[PDB]
Design a protein around this ligand. Structure first.
Ligand SMILES: O=P(O)(O)O[C@H]1[C@H](OP(=O)(O)O)[C@@H](OP(=O)(O)O)[C@H](OP(=O)(O)O)[C@@H](OP(=O)(O)O)[C@H]1OP(=O)(O)O
Length: 175
């Protein structure tokens, strides 16, 4: 447990070598990203360590390029009593600020990011407006899914149904 800090340092150095591999090899990009995700999952859930590792990985990977990792990091920060940093990460992922445009409904692009932002807002005690955004998001998801159902997009439809199931459960619990 004492050496874990130096272990984190070794993790960062190994990540840097995999970063130069990422820059050199264009066919290794997906494999490297999956390796990074699994290794980060293996590491401990300390916000400082996660921030260091993600800062190292940011050299060749923009947050938009890998939404899942930053979503997990934002969830960790939210559970670690750092809702300010979690909101900053969520707004960076979204690309626009829902806080300034309260009247403007939440963007539908990146629905996972929108759902994460909504639940963070719920944790931010803005429950009523979170519920209104939840209803708007669910109706938008259903209309979008009905419009965009196609034989080509089936995995996307399955993921959308899973997210919608989570949204309906959250709607019921919040009601
Ligand atoms: O913190 P909660 O409100 O209870 O939400 C949890 C939490 O999601 P986050 O990734 O946003 O933290 C779980 O993640 P863990 O931190 O426990 O790893 C996730 O489970 P997975 O990691 O397996 O995705 C689970 O999702 P699910 O209900 O689909 O299993 C999800 O629950 P809600 O989305 O219903 O809030």
């Amino acid at each position: 447990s004492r050496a874990y800090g130096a272990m984190v340092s070794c993790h960062m150095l190994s990540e840097l070598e995999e970063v130069i591999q990422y820059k050199l090899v264009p066919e290794r990009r997906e494999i490297i990203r999956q390796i990074w995700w699994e290794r980060l999952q293996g590491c401990q859930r300390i916000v400082e360590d996660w921030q260091k590792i993600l800062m190292v990985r940011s050299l060749v990977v923009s947050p938009h390029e890998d939404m899942r990792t930053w979503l997990k990091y934002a969830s960790l920060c939210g559970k670690s009593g750092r809702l300010a940093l979690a909101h900053k990460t969520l707004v960076l992922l979204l690309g626009v600020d829902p806080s300034r445009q309260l009247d403007h409904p939440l963007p539908t692009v990146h629905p996972q990011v929108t759902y994460a932002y909504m639940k963070n807002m719920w944790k931010s005690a803005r429950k009523i407006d979170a519920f209104q955004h939840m209803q708007h998001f669910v109706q938008t998801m259903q209309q979008q899914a009905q419009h965009a159902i196609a034989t080509e997009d089936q995995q996307h439809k399955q993921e959308l149904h899973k997210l919608m199931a989570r949204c309906f459960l959250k709607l019921g619990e919040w009601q």
